[PDB]
Every structure is written in C-alpha cells, then in structure tokens.
Assembly symmetry: D2
Homo-oligomer: 386 residues x 4
C-alpha cells in the first residue's frame, strides 16, 4: 500500500523468510503433508477441498489441495495486481480452462468475448470442449451480446498479435453485473492493472514476462475471494498444478520484472521508429508509436508502450516468410517475454480455420534485452535478403 511497485516486486511473497533466517523461499517437493491429529486433519482437508485458502499453522494435507511455494507466488502477484487473492496452474491455458469450468459449474456456461484473442483461448471457446457456448462481440456490442446465461466477459489488451487496445472502463460498464476477465499477459502488472478499472479476474500466462527466461511454464489469475475459491475448487479435483520448482522460478522472475520490462520497452520504442523508416515495412503496430490509440489509453490505462511489435510487410506472405528465415541473432520461435528477441509469422504458427485470422504480411516481434543497434542490424539484414 505504502511501498512502490518496484519494491513490491522484490519483497512480494517473501514474508517470514527473514525471521526464519533464510534469503529465498525453499522448494518443498513433498506430495503429502502429515497432520497433527484426526480432528484438525479432517477439518483442514475439507477446508481446502472446498476451495478455501490455507489457515496459518494448519497442515497443507496434500499438494493437490495446497503447496507453500505456489502460495508465495500467488500472494506476490495479487499484491501487484491489487487483487484479494490469486490461483496458479501448470500453464496459462490451464488457468483459462479452470476459469471457464468454474463459470459452467455455477450455471453460467455462456461467454461474451472480443474476437482479437490468443489462438488457444479462441480455439478453446469455439470448440466448446468444457461445455461452453460463445457469442463473439465487438467492444461496442458487449452489452447486446450479454445473455441471462453469461458467466464471464473475456478481453485481451494489447491483443495477440495485432496489439489492438481495448478500453477497460467501457467494457466493465457494458458488462454491468457480469464479471470481466482481462488477459494482461502482454502489459504485465508493471504497465496495466485491470482490477483498478473494475475487472473481476486478471489472467497472466506466467510462461511470458513473469518467468522472463523461457524456462518456466505457468498460469495465474488475480481475482476477488469468491472467484479464487471457485478456481481452487476446480484445481483440487482437476489437478492442473504448478510444480514447486516452476513456482520458484516464476516468483524469482517477479523480482526482476520491473527492471526487465522497462529495459525491453526502451529497446522496443526505439526499434519501432527505426523499422518504420525501412521501405519494405508498410506499417508498425506499437501502442507508443500508434496508429490505433485515439482514445488516450496510453496514460489512463497503460503506463508504457510494451515490448511487443507487429510489422506489416510490402510483399505479403513471401516477404514475411523470407524475413523470418533470414534472421540469425533474432530467433524464429513462438512465445514472448524472454531475455532474447523472438520472431514469428502468426498466420502460420499462432493457419486452417478462422474469421479473425491476421494478415499474411504481419510479423510479431518479442523484444528482449539485447542492444538496440545489434537487433536493428540483424532485422535490416533479413529484410535486405529478399
């Protein structure tokens, strides 16, 4: 509350470690947790199975009910997003799966969603695997798409890959009594805090930016106590758990999140302007050097431009394909938020059946922590290799 976000990222979820005479949280691989007696054991099992948080001093009983290393990572992100509690899972898709199953179980299987979403999130809603029905709606048509069966309104900003922004204040107003789930993977709690704009749930693919080194899969939703209990009820019986070492590395990554994001953001802001001058590129999508931020969201909603850039090329698919293959320092791979700069053709990786399929000339670029001159020299060499 009185500490700045930079301090909260370092010391968040590190309570009681200094008193115990330790520097970093220990990795407890224990699958089972012994109990003091039958009465407290049975009470603690039922308490956690029904989605409640662990009481201090009580036994965790089993790893599928509670794990301390995961709980430390959960409290660390909840403080950053200004949320009451948070629930962590194996991947970002496991968190989305639990969020949708919680809505279905509560008798609300219908979901209202904006079309520019992550490929996996879009495919999971379209298939209706978890007993869900979806109505694809635009920012202005959210209120109309709301049914008496809607359990959640799913939004993502900046969108993956185009980086289209969404006004969160208007979305919450349109949803009204329906909770809003905001995928804040790209912005991170450093740039955006949807809970402050009135959102109920905030999803993050911890695999990107929260980990920051491309070596820890994870998913986490910062939300109020009601949805946290519903998500833990699902987690206890579906079991898409985050491994203790995975939780350790994601919590470890949160300490350097503010420093890494600001460094990659500075490089991305400069690269977007330098690449715009190249004749092979027709458009540069970047919230800071924007062609789609007339609403003044950069300042009101986002405290920074981000570290992602989408580039439209003048030869369509052929130029986009050649540019990706001729990169040497920049690695052609899916995923983002890592220490190294990655590149992809979203239409072929993020390809068979879609209405909101991105342009063939579009190329997504995750900016890492390399020098700005070395990254432009490599991207210019790949563009000139046409």
């Amino acid at each position: 509350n009185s500490m700045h976000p930079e301090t909260l990222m370092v010391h968040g979820g590190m309570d009681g470690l200094t008193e115990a005479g330790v520097h970093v949280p220990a990795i407890d691989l224990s699958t089972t947790n012994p109990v003091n007696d039958v009465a407290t054991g049975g009470d603690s099992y039922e308490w956690l199975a029904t989605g409640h948080a662990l009481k201090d001093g009580d036994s965790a009983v089993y790893q599928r009910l509670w794990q301390p290393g995961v709980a430390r990572f959960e409290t660390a992100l909840a403080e950053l997003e200004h949320a009451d509690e948070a629930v962590a899972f194996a991947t970002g898709m496991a968190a989305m799966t639990a969020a949708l199953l919680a809505a279905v179980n509560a008798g609300t299987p219908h979901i209202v969603a904006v079309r520019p979403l992550y490929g996996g999130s879009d495919h999971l809603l379209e298939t209706g695997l978890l007993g869900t029905t979806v109505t694809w709606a635009k920012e202005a048509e959210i209120a109309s798409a709301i049914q008496d069966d809607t359990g959640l309104v799913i939004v993502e900003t900046p969108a993956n890959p185009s980086l289209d922004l969404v006004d969160l204040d208007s979305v919450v107003a349109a949803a009204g009594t329906v909770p809003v789930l905001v995928d804040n993977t790209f912005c991170t709690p450093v740039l955006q805090q949807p809970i402050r704009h009135g959102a109920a749930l905030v999803l993050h693919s911890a695999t990107k930016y929260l980990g920051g080194h491309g070596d820890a899969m994870g998913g986490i939703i910062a939300t109020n106590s009601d949805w946290a209990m519903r998500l833990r009820q699902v987690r206890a019986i579906t079991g898409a758990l985050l491994h203790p070492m995975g939780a350790y590395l994601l919590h470890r990554g949160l300490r350097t999140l503010a420093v890494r994001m600001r460094a990659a953001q500075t490089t991305a802001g400069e690269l977007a302007e330098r690449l715009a001058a190249h004749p092979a590129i027709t458009a540069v999508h970047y919230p800071g050097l924007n062609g789609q931020d007339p609403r003044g969201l950069l300042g009101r909603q986002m405290s920074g431009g981000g570290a992602m850039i989408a580039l439209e090329l003048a030869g369509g698919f052929d130029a986009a394909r050649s540019f990706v293959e001729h990169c040497s320092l920049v690695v052609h791979a899916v995923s983002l938020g890592g220490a190294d700069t990655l590149i992809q053709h979203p239409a072929s990786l993020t390809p068979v059946a879609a209405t909101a399929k991105p342009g063939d000339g579009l190329i997504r670029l995750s900016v890492g922590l390399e020098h700005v001159d070395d990254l432009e020299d490599d991207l210019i060499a790949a563009l000139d290799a046409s």
Copy 2:
C-alpha cells in the same frame, strides 16, 4: 520386448543416450522450441495441436505441444504396460480429467463405473463438471448399464481403500465395444498389466510408487494410438502439463520400481499375518492372501499381494482414531507408495464429507507399507494398538 520387466524398468525410455555420450536424460526447461522454416514449423505445430506424436527430427515448437523428458517417461511406462503409447499430465486427476473430456468431445459423455473408486475420481464423475453423466454399476451389471452414448468403463483394482478386487477379463467381455479404463496405481506394471486382459486405457497416479519417494506429482495413461491422440488433443489446449523435473524424477523412479515394490510387498505379507494375530483387529484385508479372493485373481491377474493393507478394528471410530494418533515411526498422512510407511483413517480424512454408502467403514484403516524393517514396523503398530 525379449527383455524381462526388471531390465525394462532400468533401460526403458533411455534410447539414444548411450550413443550421445550421456548416462541419464537431460532436463530441458525450454518453454519454446525454435523451427527451421515457416513451412515445417507450421506443419509441426498443426500435427502436435491435433494430438499427433512428435516425428523424429521435427521441432517440438512449444512445451504445451511436446516436451522430450516427458516423452521419455511416456515411452518407458508404455513398454512396461505393453501399450502402444502413453500421455503424461501434472497429476493423476489431470489424466482422469483429460480422459473424460476426450470421451465428451467424441460425442460419448456417458461413463459406466464400479462404485469402489478413489474419492477424487468418484467426486469428479458425480459432480458432472466436465459435462459427464454417470451410471454406477456393479461388476455383473456392467453390460446392462452400457448406453448408446457410453465413452468409457472405469474400473480400479485393488480398490482404494478396501482393496476389493475386480475380474478384468469379465469386465472387458461385459463392456464389449466400449473401451475399458483401468486404474492400476496400487498394483503398478510390476504386478498387473490390464492391457494384456483386454483393457484399452491404464491410468496411474505416478505420484505413488512410480515416483516412490513422495516428491514428484504426476499422472499417466498407457493406451492405444487412438486414445493417445485424444488425450494429447485435450492436453494441448487445457495444458495440465507435467514439469520436466517432475518427469525426470518419475522416469528415475521407474528404474528402482521392481526392486522397491518387491521389498515393500515382502514386508506387507509378513505384517498382514502378524497384525491378524492381534485381538484389537477383527479383519485384515490384503490381496496377497487368497481368503477374500475366491475367483483366483492372485496368479491370473496379479503376480503379487501388493504393499497396501486395510484393517478393521474392534472399537470402530474411537479405536481407529487412537491407533492413528499413537503411531510414532509410522506417519499419519494421506498418499501411498513412498519409502516411508504411512497410515490414514479414510472415514475421518478423505471420506469424512462423503455419503454413508460411498464412504468406507468407520473402523477401517489404510496402511501403505514402505522399506523399513518388518520388526520395527510391527513394534510401532502394536504400541499404538496397546495405547487404547
């Protein structure tokens, strides 16, 4: 194939490591996997997203699509269970969740299941969270319970906690064209191989026995290529993934599985007859004894008694509660298959908030036998029984 199961446990899933000049498989924590070009990268993405196994030489693309350390653990168990392929997940419940969602997606949401099952598996079917409908049936009433939209027949033997056995040959005959999923957590591939009896899928909570040290959560289903694709299709979009270090420790544990199981089984067989002589215990349930097994399943289906023992006490809830609390060496905790011997009161912990019929007897006590000496374990259990 021409190797004994003891040899297969050690060298299973270790192909190509000796040629690469390494002893154990490396732990690759990589979340993303680079691609050679857009054409091969995109094709590899679509094949793995549609649940296909990774073709040799192709890039894994992303960890939610494929991971090499998990794949090594998958091939190791599949060879032990005599299955074509296997799919691993974060926990045993994640594997069950994916198997049920695979059936629902194929237009078969109905499941026929025999009542004595693990608490979580029973609760997941009863709630119908994953869009499933269930008809609880007995071993003889499986054929009648089969509906036109049945996707699976779920069976578990020895059952958790009572250790009731199920004739798998008769179950497969009753199911007919419906695939049979058999939870083989308690027996492990050392004692039982349901695929040999005609089962289609074999679930294992790798958290117990496969890991063997109580430090690696996991779940895995050894099955034919058809269900392996359906399970991977669900895994790719739901993402209940097994962490590379978790997969490493479960694969590591498989090397010592036959040696650990036989050692714990020996101690369990000795403790079953020693505890039966005590007057405080009315009955000792143990698959290794042919008493409660009139069908001759120990020999045809199971090559050993196991390392789990259920005990019925003469004082009901009060004696069961006191016996658990007075144990010092034996630790009162949930879970099984570890090196440490554990004890639990199912009617007071896992099945306390459960209905009268589905919950076990208030005097029943489950005991997972470990690698401690038989004399030190009986002395501790006798001291706890005499303390009431």
Copy 3:
C-alpha cells in the same frame, strides 16, 4: 537408536519434518542467511568458521559456513556408519583433498597408504600437490612405514579394481596412535562399518551407491568430532561445497540403499559363478566366491559379497578391448553403483594416471552390477565374449 539399519536408511536425517507438516526435506538454495542481531550473528560466524557444527536456533550465516540440506545428509550417514559426525563435499576427491589438507595443516604431512587404491587417490598422493609425502606400504609393513610426522593411514577394501580385501582390525593395530582413513565406497554402510573395527575416518564417494542413479556427484567422511571440525575448517575456506539439490538426491538415495544393494549383490553373486564357467575368462574376482577370502573377513568384516566383479581374460589387451566394445545392454563407461550395469578396462581409463608398476593387468575388466535381470546380463556378456 534401537532401529535396524534398513529403518535408519529411510528415516535417517528426517528429524522434525513430520512435526513441521512436511514429507521430504526442502531444498533451500539460499546463499546467505540473515541474522537476528550483530552479537549473535558475529558469534555464529566465528563458531562455524572455526569448524564447529551449527547450534539449534542459530542462523547458518552463509552457505560456505553451513547448509541445512547438506547437514541432513551428513547426520543420516553418520548414524549408518556409527560415527559422531560427517562432513560432505562436491566430490569424493574433494573430501580426500580436505582430509589430506587437514593432516598437512596439523603438522603431519606424511601419509602411509596401501598400493591397491582408486587411480585419483593414488595420483593425488604421488604428485604431492597438497604438500603431502607418501610411503607406499603393504598390510604387514604398515607399522614399519609409520614415521614421526604421519597424519593418517589410507586403506580401501574391496580395492578398486582387483577387489583385494584388507583386514581392518590388523591395520588399526599396526597404525596404533595414527588415525586410519578407510574408503568404504564399494561396500557401503550396508556391508561394512570401519568405525566399529577402530577406524577414525570413513570416506565414501557418494557419487556411487549412495546416489545410486548416476546423477549426483558427492563425497562424505563419517568421523569423530575432532576430525569433523578440522574438515569443516578446510571446507569453510577452500569451499568445495555440495550443492543443495545434490545433497537432496544423495539423502533421497540413502532411503533405497539397502534395497538396491541387496538386489545388485544377488545378481552379482550369480553372474560371477556363471561367467567363471566360460572358457574365455581365466579368473573371476568376487569376495563371495571360493578361494578369494582365506582370512574369514566375509562374516566378521563384510556382511555381503558386494555388487562389483573384476575378471582376467585369456587374450590380454585384445580380448579385454573386444569384450568391452561388443557389449550392447551393458554400457562401456567409467563409474559404478548406478541402476544400470557398466563395464570398463581399468588400465586405459580409471587407473591410467597411476605409475606403470601399480597399474592393473591388461586382461582385467571391472564390472559394476546394476538392477537388471540376471539372465539378460549374462546373455549380453556371453554374446560380447563370443564376438572374439
């Protein structure tokens, strides 16, 4: 205290975990450890820097001074070897290095050692890198080789590779007042406990058998409080530390040590007799085999034959090289004590830096027996012998 060695391997070094509500010890990667105040922090720093063990409740201060996971592994082995304390290091050679530097620092740089030793230990003494002087002596000539500045008598039984046994009771009598250091890597605390025969220090290359899965390097010396303090003084300033995850896996491996050792020993006892019948092998060296132990050490010193087998071939170097290269299931690699069976030519790999006079025979081949089936291992070794 009144527990069997099998029970002690599972619960050794696991005190207070059940009270804290945890199953296995946590891996604390912390490099630094905060202090309550300047007075207690400074005193605990001085206490640990001077080689003393950590007091309960006091802060570890720094990892180079103390680490809890390593300390758990240390107390677990000390109970098995019947020693007061134990000190762990990065490798078996790091423990040997610290033992020699502790003797040199105490004004005793001379070491009396029996010639059949592991290659690295032999080369480290011959070079005199750590300011050591060595007098190579036989079992009977130990007393004569003792000089006024002797620090310790180094002995290893069964010796690497030949598997020569040494009567430890006679060695302690010959040494008299000088402490005896026994490398018990091959026997392990399951088969031999040199402390009961009067030895002062017991070195184990934890890398083999204690780990048991070929994935954790380590070294440890079970000894009295005086030598434990001297070893910790050297460790605090030289810093050859055992990593917390390495200590976790070696402590994890101790829980299955008795079960794994007995399983490999049974296979080795049968393999040594089956390989003796082959005409290509002239002699099979194994402690538990006729004409290999005239002093009756197998019974009063060793409770088992072990899991290592050395054998001489009738073609010398050419037959030894062909036999190693034609093995498929048995892997040609250095090291031992793992779950898989390994084979080597000691003259070309382990005992290569040793002087030509102390080098083993060219026809000799060392074999570490794993946990595979006895029939599959003999079929592979017979196929390799017949390929020449």
Copy 4:
C-alpha cells in the same frame, strides 16, 4: 559485425541451441559419460585429465573431467571479459584455492597481494594452508615485493568493504612478467574488464551479481589457455565442481546482468548522495561521488559507480550496531549482488587489519529509491 556487451550477455554460451531446436541449455545431471571405444575413451580421458578443453564430438568421460552446462557458462563469461577460456568451481573461494594451488604446483608458491581484500581471500593467504607464502604490499610497492618465486599478483577493485580503487594499468607495469589476478566481483564485466588493462586472470564470485538472486553459489576465473589448462588440471583431481543446476542458474543470471547492474547502480548513485545529507553519517564512500577518485579511473577503468556503498557513522560501534538492527525492509545479512538490499557490520561479521567499527557496507538491490531511503533514515533516527 561485433556485438555490444548487452547482446553478448543474452546470447553468450548459447551456440548450437537454436540449431538443435531448443531455447535454453538442458541440465545434464549425468555423473558418468559413455565412450564409443577403448582407444577414443582413453585418449579423451587423458586429454581432459591434463587440463585440455573438450573436443567437439568427443565424450566427456566423467563429470570431474568435463560437464557441458558448466562449459556453456564458462564460454559465456570468457566472451564478456575478453579472455580466451574460463574455469568454473563450486564457490569463489574454490576458484581462489585452485588459482593458488596451480601457482604452487608450477614452483611459484610466493604471492604478492594488496592489503584491502575479501576476508576469506586474506585469511587463506595468511594461513598458508595450500603451501603459499605471502608478502603484503601497497600499489606503489608491488615491484619491490616481487620475489624470484612469485606466481601471482592478487588485486581487488573496488575493495571489500571500503571500496578503495586500484590503478590496474600501473599494477601490470609493476608486476612485469608476473601474471596478475584481479577479483572483479564488485564491478562485474559490465563496468570493468581487467584483461583489457593487461591482467592475466580475472576471478568472480559468481554467487554475487552473476547469479543475481542469492540462490546459486559459484566461482569462475576468465584467463588465457595456459592458466585455464592449469586450473582444469587442479579441478580434475581436487574436484571442487560447480553443480549442473548451479551452472544453469549462473548462466541464466548473466542474461539479465547488464539490466540488473544498471538499475541497482542508478539507485546506489542517488542513495549515496541522499545519505550524505544525514548528520549521523560522517563520510559516504562510493566511486561515483566527487572527491573519491583523483586518478580518473571512472572512465578509463570503470564505466560506472557500482551498486555497493560503504559509510562511516558518527557513533562508532554503537551507532553501527543500532542502525543495522533497526532496518526492516533492508535485511541484515552477509553477501551482495542480489535483487534485495542487504546491510552488514564488516567488523563483527566477515584483529587482522580490520575496517573501522563505524563502517557499514550496503549492497543496493532493485527496490525503489524512495522506499530504501525511508527505511535507512528510520533506522538512523532510532538511535
């Protein structure tokens, strides 16, 4: 075509990973490594036992001879320090131990060293445990202290704790033919590269800054092929090995080293000036502060002030003791280079040429500048 140091920190030691279809290096825990045949296996064993680097395609044979994850971390730091090769060990003290034993083995047991050094390095030389003799000399008296059997000239800048700087160009000139070992733990390859100034060996306690999260012990010396071969010869038989997961986390930390160091340096530069205005502190030692570097080393030798701050208090031991006990956000613990801010009393923790009792060392982390200021002022006012 040459890459900047910021790019080299990210992609250093990552060669062949993109071609193999992997993002980060795998952790190979293997203790032993199988061989193709007796002839190649035996030759590879002798090659690595005599301190040579592993040839591509050859088997590592055993972990005490070679480990791939450690080798990747070694090549990553060598490129940053502009050295030919590097040798990694369990701790910074294990690296110092091997550096001294390599000198003793070469018939040069005498070492010339400057008095302001790390406590452990100072105690290891004074004791003479590894068969070493030491002559303590000042910057100007290095040439005179050089004996016929001198193996190394050990220097550390900024010194631990006082942060006293040493002109490395003059030290190399004074040493002449004797190789110079520089402990570059505090500056890191981001700020200083002693190899460029003519140093032969550069030691780093990887435990600090290279790891950056206080969870990976380590030590590493960036040096030429001759000393690297000698250091690997000692490592192969003494066995103070860096664990594969430890090497993985230290290599992982190098990717964010430039970004973390610059962030902590900015906070330290502001804190040193804000704390100077407080009346309880008599003097604030920081390389970047005015009147603290008359030789112009900031610019020629160091590209930044660093993230460490030592300061003298006006009450001696009592004020220093109270200040560290009243800190709440800043943690009283030994060590440095982590994500969190640590504080210590160098006289009590870590009577041999000791620093002043009023001196307090402070490792600046990645927290906000205002929150650190508020906590330290509250602790000073509590006296």
